[PDB]
Write a protein that binds this DNA or RNA. Structure first.
Length: 88
DNA sequence: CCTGCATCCGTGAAACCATATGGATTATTAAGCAAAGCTTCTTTTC
């Protein structure tokens, strides 16, 4: 379904903020322009801000859990250091 | 002067005035923004 399109969204976000290029995620319209030029596609077309908030909105809680769990896999070296000093 | 004793010092187990002043705080406004809502094009139904 659309869940796979969201998977490529967060994966491109993972590469994007992983390679020290941050400022293009927090602003939204330029980010959607970036996603449209790299050629992601939900239902045969480009991405609208309404369409973006729908596809983020129309979404299941367990799938969201799956997406953040998949997202945390690249950022493992940060989290091991993060929790090694919090084992109280 | 140099051999010979003493010791002793270390060492561990008040109030105000005045005057700037600028930095800190508050108000005030332009920008912007997410969310909503027209307007037309497809898409699905009988």
């Amino acid at each position: 379904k659309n869940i796979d399109t969201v998977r490529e969204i967060i994966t491109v976000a993972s590469i994007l903020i992983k390679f020290s290029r941050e400022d293009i995620v927090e602003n939204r319209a330029n980010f959607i322009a970036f996603l449209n030029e790299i050629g992601v596609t939900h239902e045969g077309r480009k991405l609208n801000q309404n369409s973006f908030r729908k596809i983020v909105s129309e979404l299941t809680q367990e799938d969201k859990k799956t997406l953040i769990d998949e997202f945390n896999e690249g950022f493992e070296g940060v989290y091991r250091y993060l929790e090694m000093y919090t084992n109280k």
